[PDB]
Design an enzyme around this catalytic site. Structure first.
Site, short mmCIF file in Angstrom:
data_model
loop_
_atom_site.label_atom_id
_atom_site.label_comp_id
_atom_site.label_asym_id
_atom_site.label_seq_id
_atom_site.Cartn_x
_atom_site.Cartn_y
_atom_site.Cartn_z
N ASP B 153 34.27 43.03 42.92
CA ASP B 153 35.72 43.23 42.76
C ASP B 153 36.51 42.12 42.10
O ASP B 153 37.60 41.73 42.53
CB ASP B 153 36.31 43.64 44.08
CG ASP B 153 37.60 44.39 43.92
OD1 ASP B 153 37.90 45.06 42.87
OD2 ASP B 153 38.38 44.34 44.87
N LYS B 155 38.92 40.42 39.68
CA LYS B 155 40.19 40.69 39.02
C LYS B 155 41.17 39.57 39.39
O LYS B 155 41.01 38.87 40.39
CB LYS B 155 40.78 42.04 39.45
CG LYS B 155 40.75 42.28 40.92
CD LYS B 155 41.54 43.50 41.32
CE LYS B 155 41.46 43.78 42.81
NZ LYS B 155 41.84 45.21 43.11
N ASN B 158 42.51 38.95 43.04
CA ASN B 158 41.66 38.37 44.08
C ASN B 158 41.29 36.89 43.84
O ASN B 158 40.42 36.36 44.54
CB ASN B 158 40.37 39.18 44.21
CG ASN B 158 40.59 40.53 44.82
OD1 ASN B 158 41.64 40.80 45.37
ND2 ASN B 158 39.61 41.39 44.70
N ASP B 171 38.74 38.09 49.23
CA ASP B 171 38.44 39.50 49.37
C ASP B 171 36.99 39.86 49.00
O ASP B 171 36.65 40.12 47.85
CB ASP B 171 39.44 40.36 48.61
CG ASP B 171 39.49 41.78 49.17
OD1 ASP B 171 40.57 42.43 49.13
OD2 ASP B 171 38.50 42.33 49.67
N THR B 188 37.72 48.17 40.90
CA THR B 188 39.03 48.45 40.34
C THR B 188 38.81 49.04 38.96
O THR B 188 38.02 48.50 38.22
CB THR B 188 39.83 47.15 40.32
OG1 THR B 188 39.96 46.63 41.65
CG2 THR B 188 41.25 47.37 39.80
#
Lengths: 20, 337
Positions: B153, B155, B158, B171, B188
């Protein structure tokens, strides 16, 4: 411009993850 | 030497992976200051540990909502993994515990805010600035992947900026320990690797694709694949046609062509030399990797903060109360948390 297209899009704020 | 550090790191990880820490604090030890972030699954709050004065970020997850959204296993993954790792650019899990209604993970606070905030406000980062952050992700993934962990994840949302201007990845809600292949559609949309969306089965190479997306976004100010609805984004991703802005250097363009490579047999990070094809690329030639690791490089951006417990680098959210039922909810589903 691509910038202007991005800023006009609905995806400029925090992006939530998708789940299954 | 990197390899000797990695084997000593894998020996520590394993010991804690096999025998996780549980129940290391309680809610009543903490003063709740402010909501810093909200989520599909839960909320993160600035918290003060009353007896020490130490500030932390506390992720609160509603157990019933976790069950409804079918994230039980991912949530157990997240805590299990977080308590076992140790690396300068990963947030430290300090305490974890649970009650009748909720699960709590108390982590390191990074007062500089989300990279996301600074990125959208400023518009885009210079290549040197982008590279400083990218090298920290490269090393973090080198560490994670050596433990058989996939992150899944990445991005700007985070990535937190600490007091010295360095990154903390937060996260781990989709992180998973996997040798071989896994199948969950998660992440995402803008950061999904083509493999993921085509339901092929995938591995740690998805994280190197996402590093490509991240470097592009940091340097351009917008992601390489965007549109108003997710299904439109997936179309562009699988087609894999990328346009680079004029101001990208040719070295940048070449690194990104190798990261955003649809065919995972030609994707950097996934070839016989592994992470070394990235670290030795010409775009990273000025990078001293050990100096980044030791944090001896001065940061191009150090965020202005007036004291610990300051939240001015964070957006405001609607505050909710923490409700704790008198009956235990979902006991056996989270018994190992």
């Amino acid at each position: 411009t691509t910038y202007a297209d991005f800023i006009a899009s609905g995806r400029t704020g925090r992006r939530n993850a998708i789940h299954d | 030497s990197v390899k000797e550090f990695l084997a000593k790191a894998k020996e520590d990880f394993l010991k804690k992976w096999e025998n996780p820490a549980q129940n290391t604090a309680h809610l009543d030890q903490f003063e709740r200051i402010k909501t810093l972030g909200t989520g599909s699954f839960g909320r993160v709050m600035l918290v003060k540990h009353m007896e020490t004065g130490n500030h932390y970020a506390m992720k609160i997850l509603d157990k019933q909502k976790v069950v409804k959204l079918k994230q039980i296993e991912h949530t157990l993954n997240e805590k299990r993994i977080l308590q076992a790792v140790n690396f300068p650019f990963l947030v430290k899990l300090e305490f974890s515990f649970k009650d009748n209604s909720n699960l709590y993970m108390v982590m390191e606070y990074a007062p500089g805010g989300e990279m996301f905030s600074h990125l959208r406000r400023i518009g885009r980062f210079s290549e040197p600035h982008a590279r400083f952050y990218a090298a920290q992700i490269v090393l973090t993934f080198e560490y994670l992947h050596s433990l058989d962990l996939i992150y899944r994840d990445l991005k700007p949302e985070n990535l937190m900026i600490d007091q010295q201007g360095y990154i903390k990845v937060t996260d781990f809600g989709f992180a998973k320990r996997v040798k071989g292949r896994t199948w969950t559609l998660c992440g995402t949309p803008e950061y999904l690797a083509p493999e993921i969306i085509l339901s092929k089965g995938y591995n740690k190479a998805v994280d190197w694709w996402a590093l490509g997306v991240l470097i592009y976004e940091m340097a351009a100010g917008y992601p390489p694949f965007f549109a108003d609805q997710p299904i439109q984004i997936y179309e562009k991703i699988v087609s894999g046609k990328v346009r680079f802005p004029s101001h990208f250097s040719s070295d940048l363009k070449d690194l990104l062509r190798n990261l955003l490579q649809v065919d995972l047999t030609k994707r950097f990070g996934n070839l016989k030399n592994g992470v070394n094809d990235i670290k030795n690329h010409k775009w990273f030639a000025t990078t001293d990797w050990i100096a980044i690791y030791q944090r001896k490089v001065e940061a191009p951006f150090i965020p202005k903060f007036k004291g610990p417990g300051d939240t001015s680098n964070f957006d405001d959210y609607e505050e909710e109360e923490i409700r704790v039922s008198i009956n235990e909810k979902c006991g056996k589903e989270f018994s190992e948390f």
